[PDB]
UniProtKB/Swiss-Prot annotation:
Subunit composition and interactions: Monomer.
One function term, GO molecular function aspect: beta-N-acetylglucosaminidase activity
PANTHER family given in the database record: LYSOZYME C
The name this protein goes by in its record: Lysozyme C
Family under the similarity heading: Belongs to the glycosyl hydrolase 22 family.
Cysteine-cysteine disulfides: 6-127, 30-115, 64-80, 76-94
Domain of life: Eukaryota
Pfam families linked: Lys
Species: Gallus gallus
Gene name, Swiss-Prot/TrEMBL: LYZ
Amino acid sequence: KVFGRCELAAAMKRHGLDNYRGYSLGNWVCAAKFESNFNTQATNRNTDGSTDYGILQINSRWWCNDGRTPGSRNLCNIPCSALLSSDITASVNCAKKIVSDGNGMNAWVAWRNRCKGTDVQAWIRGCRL
Ligand SMILES: [Cl-]
Ligand SMILES: [Cl-]
Ligand SMILES: [Rb+]
């Protein structure tokens, strides 16, 4: 599923991500924009043999099981395919674990490089939320 911007903002709020670990909703929308362009089905291989999945490009080396990533830990206890669903619950639940792991949203390099410090409220501006 390809979300609209305000649509995704609303879905993320509905699943308790607004201000989770102190990160405002616009941070999460911005991260999703640059990780997946709001496409739940996005997948991308990493140089190391792992793959990133879904709306927040969650990585099969630590977080989900895809059966092809030696050493995976599956800390979200989910198949990586669950992170591709039109329903964002599994991706939200797992992102909550990732952002709690110690480095906050720096776990998403694209958030650090493209969102951090910017006017992230722009991502929710105009939205009926
Ligand atoms: Cl915001
Ligand atoms: Cl933090
Ligand atoms: Rb596990």
